[PDB]
Motif scaffolding. Sequence first.
Motif, mmCIF file in Angstrom:
data_model
loop_
_atom_site.group_PDB
_atom_site.id
_atom_site.type_symbol
_atom_site.label_atom_id
_atom_site.label_comp_id
_atom_site.label_asym_id
_atom_site.label_seq_id
_atom_site.Cartn_x
_atom_site.Cartn_y
_atom_site.Cartn_z
ATOM 1 N N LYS A 23 -0.931 -10.413 7.382
ATOM 2 C CA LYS A 23 -1.598 -10.832 6.236
ATOM 3 C C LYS A 23 -0.792 -10.694 5.045
ATOM 4 N N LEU A 24 -0.316 -11.655 4.301
ATOM 5 C CA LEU A 24 0.661 -11.597 3.262
ATOM 6 C C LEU A 24 -0.180 -12.318 1.892
ATOM 7 C CD1 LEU A 24 4.177 -12.812 4.534
ATOM 8 C CD2 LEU A 24 3.214 -10.465 4.427
ATOM 9 N N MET A 25 -0.403 -11.329 0.859
ATOM 10 C CA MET A 25 -1.146 -11.563 -0.294
ATOM 11 C C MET A 25 -0.299 -11.640 -1.506
ATOM 12 S SD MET A 25 -4.486 -9.280 0.880
ATOM 13 C CE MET A 25 -3.139 -8.340 1.760
ATOM 14 N N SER A 26 -0.373 -12.848 -2.075
ATOM 15 C CA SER A 26 0.497 -13.200 -3.489
ATOM 16 C C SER A 26 -0.558 -12.922 -4.666
ATOM 17 C CB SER A 26 0.985 -14.481 -3.522
ATOM 18 O OG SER A 26 1.791 -14.438 -4.739
ATOM 19 N N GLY A 27 -0.228 -12.894 -5.964
ATOM 20 C CA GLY A 27 -0.803 -12.946 -7.149
ATOM 21 C C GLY A 27 -1.320 -11.122 -7.259
ATOM 22 N N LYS A 28 -0.495 -10.262 -6.532
ATOM 23 C CA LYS A 28 -0.996 -9.078 -6.696
ATOM 24 C C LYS A 28 0.090 -8.120 -7.264
ATOM 25 C CE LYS A 28 -4.883 -9.185 -3.861
ATOM 26 N NZ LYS A 28 -5.918 -8.205 -3.447
ATOM 27 N N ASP A 29 -0.095 -7.447 -8.405
ATOM 28 C CA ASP A 29 0.800 -6.377 -8.943
ATOM 29 C C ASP A 29 0.193 -5.231 -8.536
ATOM 30 O OD1 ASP A 29 2.155 -4.796 -10.776
ATOM 31 O OD2 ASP A 29 1.510 -5.860 -12.745
ATOM 32 N N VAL A 30 1.384 -4.458 -7.816
ATOM 33 C CA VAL A 30 1.067 -3.429 -7.036
ATOM 34 C C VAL A 30 0.684 -1.992 -7.956
ATOM 35 C CG1 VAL A 30 2.351 -3.940 -5.007
ATOM 36 C CG2 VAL A 30 3.369 -2.553 -7.054
ATOM 37 N N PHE A 31 1.118 -2.118 -9.387
ATOM 38 C CA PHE A 31 1.021 -1.111 -10.485
ATOM 39 C C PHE A 31 -0.611 -1.259 -10.729
ATOM 40 C CE2 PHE A 31 5.195 -1.864 -10.731
ATOM 41 C CZ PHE A 31 5.912 -0.484 -10.328
ATOM 42 N N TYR A 32 -1.441 -2.020 -10.230
ATOM 43 C CA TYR A 32 -2.792 -2.150 -10.521
ATOM 44 C C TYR A 32 -3.740 -2.166 -9.103
ATOM 45 C CZ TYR A 32 -1.614 -3.673 -15.074
ATOM 46 O OH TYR A 32 -1.238 -3.809 -16.611
ATOM 47 N N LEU A 33 -2.891 -1.828 -8.185
ATOM 48 C CA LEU A 33 -3.547 -1.727 -6.812
ATOM 49 C C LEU A 33 -3.956 -0.411 -6.470
ATOM 50 C CD1 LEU A 33 -1.729 -3.738 -4.057
ATOM 51 C CD2 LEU A 33 -3.927 -4.311 -4.737
ATOM 52 N N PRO A 34 -5.373 -0.168 -6.060
ATOM 53 C CA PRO A 34 -5.653 1.228 -5.635
ATOM 54 C C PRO A 34 -4.935 1.585 -4.201
ATOM 55 C CG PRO A 34 -7.589 -0.222 -5.353
ATOM 56 C CD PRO A 34 -6.544 -0.846 -5.624
ATOM 57 N N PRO A 35 -4.823 2.914 -3.866
ATOM 58 C CA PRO A 35 -3.826 3.211 -2.674
ATOM 59 C C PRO A 35 -5.087 2.796 -1.335
ATOM 60 C CG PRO A 35 -3.572 4.969 -4.257
ATOM 61 C CD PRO A 35 -4.707 4.167 -4.823
ATOM 62 N N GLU A 36 -4.464 2.417 -0.242
ATOM 63 C CA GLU A 36 -4.858 2.389 0.982
ATOM 64 C C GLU A 36 -4.393 3.383 1.859
ATOM 65 O OE1 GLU A 36 -4.701 -2.106 2.022
ATOM 66 O OE2 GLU A 36 -4.796 -2.544 -0.200
ATOM 67 N N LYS A 37 -5.253 3.702 2.905
ATOM 68 C CA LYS A 37 -5.155 4.327 3.969
ATOM 69 C C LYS A 37 -3.964 3.277 4.874
ATOM 70 C CE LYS A 37 -5.085 6.502 8.287
ATOM 71 N NZ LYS A 37 -4.006 5.677 8.778
ATOM 72 N N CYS A 38 -2.941 4.029 5.371
ATOM 73 C CA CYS A 38 -1.692 3.262 6.113
ATOM 74 C C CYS A 38 -0.954 4.397 6.863
ATOM 75 C CB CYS A 38 -1.118 2.512 5.374
ATOM 76 S SG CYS A 38 -0.087 3.251 4.172
ATOM 77 N N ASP A 39 -0.525 3.963 8.306
ATOM 78 C CA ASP A 39 0.367 4.725 8.782
ATOM 79 C C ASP A 39 1.903 4.633 8.436
ATOM 80 O OD1 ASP A 39 -1.809 5.666 10.774
ATOM 81 O OD2 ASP A 39 -1.983 3.637 10.988
ATOM 82 N N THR A 40 2.425 3.221 7.700
ATOM 83 C CA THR A 40 3.719 3.281 7.460
ATOM 84 C C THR A 40 3.494 2.598 5.989
ATOM 85 O OG1 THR A 40 4.315 2.978 9.786
ATOM 86 C CG2 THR A 40 5.864 1.943 7.804
ATOM 87 N N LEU A 41 4.210 3.107 5.010
ATOM 88 C CA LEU A 41 4.141 2.615 3.785
ATOM 89 C C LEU A 41 5.768 2.329 3.314
ATOM 90 C CD1 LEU A 41 5.199 3.273 0.294
ATOM 91 C CD2 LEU A 41 2.704 2.254 0.930
ATOM 92 N N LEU A 42 5.809 0.989 3.061
ATOM 93 C CA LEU A 42 7.141 0.442 2.553
ATOM 94 C C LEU A 42 7.274 -0.220 1.509
ATOM 95 C CD1 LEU A 42 7.725 -1.710 5.962
ATOM 96 C CD2 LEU A 42 8.387 0.536 5.634
ATOM 97 N N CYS A 43 8.190 0.024 0.590
ATOM 98 C CA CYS A 43 8.395 -0.373 -0.771
ATOM 99 C C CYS A 43 9.594 -0.957 -1.044
ATOM 100 C CB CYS A 43 7.671 0.644 -1.946
ATOM 101 S SG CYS A 43 7.514 -0.131 -3.401
ATOM 102 N N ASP A 44 9.852 -2.217 -1.699
ATOM 103 C CA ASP A 44 11.037 -2.711 -1.878
ATOM 104 C C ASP A 44 11.103 -3.294 -3.274
ATOM 105 O OD1 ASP A 44 13.725 -3.289 -1.188
ATOM 106 O OD2 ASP A 44 13.536 -5.233 -0.215
ATOM 107 N N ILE A 45 10.363 -2.683 -4.415
ATOM 108 C CA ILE A 45 10.258 -2.822 -5.699
ATOM 109 C C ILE A 45 11.298 -2.255 -6.647
ATOM 110 C CG2 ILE A 45 8.978 -2.973 -7.976
ATOM 111 C CD1 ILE A 45 6.613 -3.182 -5.398
ATOM 112 N N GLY A 46 12.001 -3.026 -7.368
ATOM 113 C CA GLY A 46 12.954 -2.539 -8.284
ATOM 114 C C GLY A 46 13.941 -3.785 -8.802
#
Length: 256
Positions: free
Chosen positions: A119-142
């Motif tokens: 499930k890919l969701m656009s219009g989402k700025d991660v700096f305003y997203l509350p954290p979610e439970k997950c087994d793998t965290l990937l981040c390619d921002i910069g």
Amino acid sequence: ETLGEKWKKKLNQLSRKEFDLYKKSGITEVDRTEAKEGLKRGETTHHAVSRGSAKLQWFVERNMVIPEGRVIDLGCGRGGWSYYCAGLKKVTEVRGYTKGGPGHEEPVPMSTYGWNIVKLMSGKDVFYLPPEKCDTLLCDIGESSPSPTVEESRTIRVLKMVEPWLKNNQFCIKVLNPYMPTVIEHLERLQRKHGGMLVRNPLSRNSTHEMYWISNGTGNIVSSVNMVSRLLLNRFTMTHRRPTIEKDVDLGAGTR
Ligand SMILES: C[S@@+](CC[C@H](N)C(=O)[O-])C[C@H]1O[C@@H](n2cnc3c(N)ncnc32)[C@H](O)[C@@H]1O
Ligand SMILES: Cc1ccc(C(=O)O)c(NC(=O)Nc2ccc(Cl)cc2N)c1
């Protein structure tokens, strides 16, 4: 002044022509010809939507990050990291978040192996997203910038945002500018608490000092950053070395 700042000052002095010859000198790259043609025709199977799939695969194949369970992909763009994880045996669900809009990539719908658990969701700025439970965290921002103080600010922002998502889970996080003393201070604090190591991906361009903080490994952060600075500085010395060409990933087809 760091070795990285000397590399950045030299990079900023290059003409467009010199910059264009430097950026790919001696790097590794996947041949995207077939995928680019297929995607132009609107093909939805086999092809990776970006070079990102091969970039994450490089880490996964060396066991630097082992995606499993619920995968969260921050700054998913077109979806290269997400579609690649969707086909991995231990992966059960993939959730991608990206800004989209003017100047940014939009998620691309695909029918590659395991498309149904994504499930890919656009219009989402991660700096305003509350954290979610997950087994793998990937981040390619910069986002790259000619200003190293802008790059330092962007890197610290990402490092502060990602920490609440880290809970004894697998991870692979982009570190845009890892050589500034303030960034090194944060990375060492983060490494003491969450473990892992900083790694240079051979698929990265010489025009970026980006390294990735991966969960499975250990080592000296300062030594690894200085090694990359010396490598990138050394690549200004010689005439253009054509990149080492590798095969792009085949993401197959079907549901799981
Ligand atoms: C390096 S690209 C991701 C490439 C991706 N890993 C792939 O394999 O296709 C980083 C992405 O993060 C997005 N991005 C940048 N800042 C963002 C933010 N604050 N929130 C969410 N996405 C953001 C950009 O639009 C861009 O598409
Ligand atoms: C400078 C640049 C480079 C590459 C891309 C790309 O997508 O490969 C890119 N995208 C966009 O500008 N996308 C875009 C433009 C207008 C509107 Cl209304 C929405 C979106 N999403 C921008």
